Design a protein around this ligand. Sequence first.
Ligand SMILES: Cc1ncsc1-c1ccc(CNC(=O)[C@@H]2C[C@@H](O)CN2C(=O)[C@@H](NC(=O)C2CCC2)C(C)(C)C)cc1
Lengths: 141, 87, 104
Amino acid sequence: VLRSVNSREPSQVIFCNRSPRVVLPVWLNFDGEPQPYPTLPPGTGRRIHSYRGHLWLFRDAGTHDGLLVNQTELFVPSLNVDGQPIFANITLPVYTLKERCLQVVRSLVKPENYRRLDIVRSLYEDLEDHPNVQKDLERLT
Amino acid sequence: MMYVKLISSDGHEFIVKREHALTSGTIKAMLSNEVNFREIPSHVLSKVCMYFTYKVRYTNSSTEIPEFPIAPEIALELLMAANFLDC
Amino acid sequence: MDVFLMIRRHKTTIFTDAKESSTVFELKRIVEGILKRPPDEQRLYKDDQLLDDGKTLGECGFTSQTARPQAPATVGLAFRADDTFEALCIEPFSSPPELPDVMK
Ligand SMILES: Cc1ncsc1-c1ccc(CNC(=O)[C@@H]2C[C@@H](O)CN2C(=O)[C@@H](NC(=O)C2CCC2)C(C)(C)C)cc1
């Protein structure tokens, strides 16, 4: 369902990383498979060549945490007006306090040791169920 | 302006805007103007209050969003509070 | 510009915001509405320094880029009982436990 259209009409885009994370851009190909692209360090920008009707999302490259692009989940290049590129501003969402705590705990504890933590079973599951692009695609669908 | 009082297990009294506290569905239920938390100490509940302020300020803003900071030493207890408070 | 504060006395902590251009006295009026004690029975402090009513929060060092939503700045508070003012006393928050082994 979620897949790029094969339009063939060029569209130039600036990916602008306004987050403190290393960013992984992900292009959804014509069969809906996620294809990873080169990463962007915190605060950097890249001018790239994409196409009208193509679909992109953006993740923390190390943890796969979800990020926003122009305040939403998905970015679709549009028609360039007067030769100007489209800006894709990548930012942190406001995470729930729970998800933010899970991020920090996942960054300190090796996955084998999640079970050694003194917490209710359901939080062991929450830690182990770490962010992943496929799961989000199956949701969005 | 309407405030409410949130009391930690060690007796610290945190006074925050009612609107901010309603970030938590659990607190909403405990109110529906003071709530005592027998399992949440002040080094955790102070951070919870700072999260309310951060969320209200930055929800629906184009102004670049900073990372919410959490010291390693408090991360596990904070996780437990967030899960109880559903926030 | 908004500044984000914790006003602290003994085991009381108020979370609120104010304008950088607002005055110390105007902050006492805010404390008056919450804790029901008039400005003339309040002393406000930045660390050990007594703040003057007519100064702005910005002049006293509370700026929008240091007094942040996720990390608010602290303003001390002392009350007058009858004749004289109590000393400034702020109770510390509890101490975190030792890091578990798997988190080291
Ligand atoms: C340097 C860089 N840093 C972070 S991302 C990035 C980067 C690096 C290289 C590119 C080159 N552009 C592409 O690959 C675009 C992006 C996406 O729209 C798909 N794509 C294509 O060129 C694709 N081509 C087309 O659709 C053409 C064939 C009909 C029009 C592809 C992968 C089938 C050859 C784009 C971005």
